[PDB]
Amino acid sequence: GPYNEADVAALVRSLDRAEDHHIFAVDVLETYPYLAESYTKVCPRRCDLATAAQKALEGAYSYDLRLEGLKADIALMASNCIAYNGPTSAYAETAAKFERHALEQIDAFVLEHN
Ligand SMILES: CC(=O)N1CC[NH+](CCn2c(CCc3ccc(C)c(C#N)c3)nc3cc(-c4c(C)noc4C)ccc32)CC1
């Protein structure tokens, strides 16, 4: 049946790493509301790990056996960072490493529970 909501939420929180300098921890516009005018045009759909953990606790991912919806939220976080900060920035480098690690951890979770 469905995944345990707390276990998925714990997976999400484990993706918030000091190795990524916590850049995906919370909504970009929660920490930097002054970016909103430019950010919402470049990135009209936002996500962050605190939001994703709450989605997990409410069952948003529970019936997605492959966790494809969570993978899509991770991909949105990374692609928004690359789009807004630009492809030559250090933020873009962190985004790519973050997404790769997140995919490895999500895949391991699916294999341990499928
Ligand atoms: C939960 C909480 O209280 N937090 C956790 C989050 N930090 C903010 C972290 N952060 C810092 C500061 C650390 C830093 C500086 C410079 C570089 C090149 C790197 C890298 N790579 C990292 N730049 C940030 C930039 C963004 C960001 C995104 C995503 N897309 O557009 C922007 C702008 C988000 C968080 C950021 C505030 C305190």
UniProtKB/TrEMBL annotation:
Residues of the full protein shown: 8 to 119 of 652
Protein name per its UniProtKB record: Bromo domain-containing protein
Species: Leishmania mexicana (strain MHOM/GT/2001/U1103)
Record-annotated membrane-spanning stretches: none
Superkingdom of the source species: Eukaryota
